[PDB]
Scaffold this motif. Structure first.
Motif, short mmCIF file in Angstrom:
data_model
loop_
_atom_site.label_atom_id
_atom_site.label_comp_id
_atom_site.label_asym_id
_atom_site.label_seq_id
_atom_site.Cartn_x
_atom_site.Cartn_y
_atom_site.Cartn_z
N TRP A 31 35.67 38.61 40.78
CA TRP A 31 34.91 39.29 42.13
C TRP A 31 33.54 39.33 41.78
CZ3 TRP A 31 37.76 42.55 45.58
CH2 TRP A 31 39.19 42.40 45.38
N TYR A 82 31.98 41.42 49.34
CA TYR A 82 32.88 41.10 48.13
C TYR A 82 33.76 39.71 48.39
CZ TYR A 82 30.90 45.27 46.50
OH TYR A 82 30.18 46.49 45.98
N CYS A 84 36.98 37.05 46.16
CA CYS A 84 37.77 36.83 44.93
C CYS A 84 37.88 35.12 44.84
CB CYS A 84 39.15 37.38 45.20
SG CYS A 84 39.83 37.31 46.72
#
Lengths: 101, 110, 101
Positions: A31, A82, A84
């Motif tokens: 992350w 954010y 991933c």
């Protein structure tokens, strides 16, 4: 590998989800926190181990193709996008972004 | 460790990425595209020590990456797309394959 | 560096006892050539592993032959530790990089 995360925008005064489409007991998900106009910063690696030199308020868990991220307590710092990233197969791919307010 | 790059552009172009904080013949160099409206992409990597190069299938045949061991510079050539570019380097502890050191950014437009 | 330690054994050898060094520990039972090729090609996409340590419990000597051939076709050094894979063969080849004990 194709990633997809919801919600695109989050309203808090929180948690995040990232679902994928493991490497011998090791989870491959990271992350990144990116303030506007700044390079990304790694936050969590191996989907369970936090990075040294970071506040302890961050913690994460997940396995398989469903992983999630949560933060507590809430402060001014978590005000960026954010994503991933996967690394099980080359090339790597990132998320779709998630604001906060 | 600090990184520097070329200036803005406005056919074909070339962008330099110079290293002045470590031994330039040891670590890989990766190129990223960050066209506004989405997160990012991934182009390829190059090892100055031996010159082994790998490219992404989406960007294959359009981006050529080269390095000079003397001046410690990285050259990426796009031929025949307006996006912000970054050249980066990993920490070196490996496995994680994360990005820690970031460049300035070269804004190309057509 | 990135080293893979693969053991094909019937004797109960577990796995937990097994600038950039990473080690891979696995336990294998079958010894058919397609399985070898599949495992090698799968791990070759696993973070650029340069080291391969192999041993066998069976007493079939063609395993070393296939290991040497694949090492030559991949330019990756391979070792022989036990069983037919550690049996000393006739005449290695300079194109190959396979070594025994």
């Amino acid at each position: 590998i194709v990633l997809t995360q919801s919600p695109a925008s989050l309203a808090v005064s929180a948690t995040i989800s990232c679902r994928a489409s493991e490497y011998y007991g090791t989870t491959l998900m990271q992350w990144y926190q990116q303030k506007p106009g700044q390079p990304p910063k790694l936050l969590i690696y191996a989907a369970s181990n936090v990075d040294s030199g970071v506040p302890a308020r961050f913690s994460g868990s997940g396995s398989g193709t469903d992983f999630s991220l949560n933060i507590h307590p809430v402060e001014e710092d978590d005000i960026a996008m954010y994503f991933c990233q996967q690394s099980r197969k080359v090339p790597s791919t990132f998320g779709g972004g998630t604001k906060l307010e | 460790v600090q990184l520097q790059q070329s200036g803005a552009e406005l056919a074909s172009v070339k962008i330099s990425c110079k290293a002045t904080g470590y031994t330039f013949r040891s670590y890989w160099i990766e190129w990223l595209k960050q066209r506004p409206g989405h997160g990012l992409e991934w182009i390829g990597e190059i090892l100055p020590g031996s010159g082994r190069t790998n490219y992404n299938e989406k960007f294959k045949g359009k981006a050529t990456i080269t390095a000079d061991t003397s001046s410690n510079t990285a050259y990426m050539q796009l031929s025949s797309d307006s996006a912000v570019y970054y050249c980066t380097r990993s920490r070196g502890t490996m496995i994680t394959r994360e990005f820690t050191y970031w460049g300035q950014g070269a804004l190309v437009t057509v | 560096l990135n080293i893979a330690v693969l053991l094909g054994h019937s004797h109960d050898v577990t796995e937990r006892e097994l600038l950039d060094v990473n080690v891979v520990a696995l336990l294998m039972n079958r010894t058919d050539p397609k399985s070898l090729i599949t495992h090698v090609c799968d791990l070759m996409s696993g973070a650029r592993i340069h080291g391969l340590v192999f041993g066998d419990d069976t007493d079939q000597e063609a395993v070393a032959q296939m290991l040497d051939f694949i090492s030559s076709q991949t330019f990756i050094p391979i070792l022989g530790i036990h069983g037919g894979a550690s049996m000393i063969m006739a005449d290695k080849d300079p194109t190959s990089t396979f070594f025994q004990f």
